[PDB]
């Protein structure tokens with residue numbers, strides 16, 4: 001379960017851009033401000049190999 | 050007195066920031082998730098690092114397709130008052146494969 005990708009990004013990748021950031025993102029309207037839940041599904045998902 | 054630059058987006062350890070520290074022509078460059086002080090000065094995931102009025106220095110910095118490009122020139126001058134007229138062309142120094150987003154910058158000074 002370790003190998004990882006961001007399931008979302010709030011801006012699409014520039015050519016050869018990298019992004020380490022651990023932001024939860026707005027998956028909806030509400031500013032969740034560090035909460036995970038509806039409007040805020042944390043993006044760094046992983047494969048199940 | 051002028052000895053470096055900060056470049057990046059949030060500039061606050063939440064993401065990578067290109068830091069250049071210089072003493073004329075020897076240089077340290079890093080891109081790491083730096084936590085700076087609130088007033089940046091030089092006292093008289095760390096994925097990239099590199100190491101190298103009488104006077105005018107000129108530079109052009111541009112960030113394209115995941116590479117950061119620097120051009121420069123040095124010359125002595127006579128106009129103390131302001132940016133001088135006349136013609137000169139900068140030449141490339143370095144091209145760094147750093148892969149980073151940049152929307153803000155700040156200059157770094159050596160203080161007592």
Ligand SMILES: *[C@@H]1O[C@H](CO)[C@@H](O[C@@H]2O[C@H](CO)[C@@H](O)[C@H](O)[C@H]2NC(C)=O)[C@H](O)[C@H]1NC(C)=O
Nearest residue numbers: 010011012013014017057058059150151152153
């Ligand atoms: C590079 O970084 C900037 C932040 O400094 C990103 O700009 C923000 O993008 C969002 C949309 O994703 C906007 O809502 C904000 O208003 C933007 N802020 C600024 C200061 O412009 C920018 O999207 C990033 N570039 C890439 C390609 O990810």
Ligand SMILES: *[C@@H]1O[C@H](CO)[C@@H](O)[C@H](O)[C@H]1NC(C)=O
Nearest residue numbers: 070071072073074075076077
């Ligand atoms: C430039 O400053 C760094 C410390 O920030 C130092 O390691 C380096 O030796 C200095 N080089 C010169 C030419 O003074």
Ligand SMILES: *[C@@H]1O[C@H](CO)[C@@H](O)[C@H](O)[C@H]1NC(C)=O
Nearest residue numbers: 020022062081082083094095
């Ligand atoms: C690099 O990212 C990890 C989380 O993936 C974090 O724990 C670590 O502190 C970061 N390293 C630095 C130098 O900030």
